[PDB]
């Protein structure tokens, strides 16, 4: 989910850092509102997949 109008900053939003599956030295990403897609931040959320069920739809 593109956050170019939320996280990107003109002087650079450098608060997001980067450096084995699901492992949780570092430099930040230079997110910028005036730059192209490569530098537009995205809110990335990963859903790994009983306790979690969606809705049962119904009618009349």
């Amino acid at each position: 989910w593109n956050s170019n109008n939320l996280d990107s900053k003109v002087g650079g939003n450098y608060n997001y850092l980067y450096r084995k599956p699901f492992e949780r030295p570092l430099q930040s990403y230079g997110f910028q509102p005036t730059n192209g897609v490569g530098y537009q931040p995205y809110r990335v959320v990963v859903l790994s997949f009983a306790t979690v069920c969606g809705p049962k739809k119904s009618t009349n």
Partner: nanobody
Amino acid sequence: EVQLVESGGGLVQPGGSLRLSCAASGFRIYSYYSYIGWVRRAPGKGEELVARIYPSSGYTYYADSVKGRFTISADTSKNTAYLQMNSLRAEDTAVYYCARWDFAGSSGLDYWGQGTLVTVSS
């Protein structure tokens, strides 16, 4: 095709300042997370780190011998790295060179610049 092309050397009096500039050929500094620093070699000495700038990450790092006097900067629209050396001393005479540190996950300095001489004297 990668080279750090540079100029801006010359004679400066101690207590004054001198600015150096490296043009990045063969790559783009901001977009590929290629970070450019400066290394110097004083007469009678081997290579010494001076500074590193990461404009795409907003970070600067300095060697202990220049902290408090030298500032490292970059202009991402010119694809050029700069070194601002304030309060220069005779001891800072050296040939200054740029070097490229890509982001990795270890890394190092593979590509180097041409070099230019900075003389500090009265």
